């Protein structure tokens, strides 16, 4: 099995998004069963709630069933999983710190954005913005997690 996990820092806009994103590309092509996918936050701010509603309205729009509880990254998410794709500079930021304070880090930890072939790196956290940048952000989702899942 193959295992990624999408990484923000509240677990309830971009990183739910792209789990989806990317579970239904999976699913599609027939190979769920290979693939362990969840999202998870770098922060404690959000946990047990669902995404943000403008992003499931996103979604929606877009045909992609999305359920998650956002939950916190854990110790043992740096054991388990192939890959941890963040968003943005500060993601990574704490990633690379958590990732330093476990014993086994099995996990290449990598921004979701050095996948788009069109090279915009950073997804920008749409929490203060508007539908336009929750679709902006749905629409890099596809192009990396399309560019991951062939190079994963």
Request: include cysteine.
């Amino acid at each position: 099995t193959k295992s990624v996990l999408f990484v923000c820092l509240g677990n309830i806009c971009r990183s739910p998004i792209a789990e989806a994103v990317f579970r239904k590309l999976v699913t599609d092509q027939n190979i769920s069963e290979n693939w362990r996918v969840d999202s998870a936050a770098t922060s404690g701010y959000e946990i047990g709630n669902p995404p943000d509603y403008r992003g499931q309205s996103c979604m929606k729009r877009h045909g992609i069933p999305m359920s998650h509880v956002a939950r916190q990254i854990t110790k043992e998410d740096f054991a388990t999983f192939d890959y941890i794709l963040c968003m943005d500079e500060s993601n990574l930021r704490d990633l690379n710190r958590k990732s330093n304070q476990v014993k086994t880090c099995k996990a290449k930890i990598e921004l979701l954005g050095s996948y788009d072939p069109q090279k915009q790196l950073i997804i920008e956290d749409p929490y203060y913005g508007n539908d336009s940048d929750f679709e902006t952000v749905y629409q890099q989702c596809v192009r990396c997690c399309r560019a991951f899942l062939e190079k994963a």
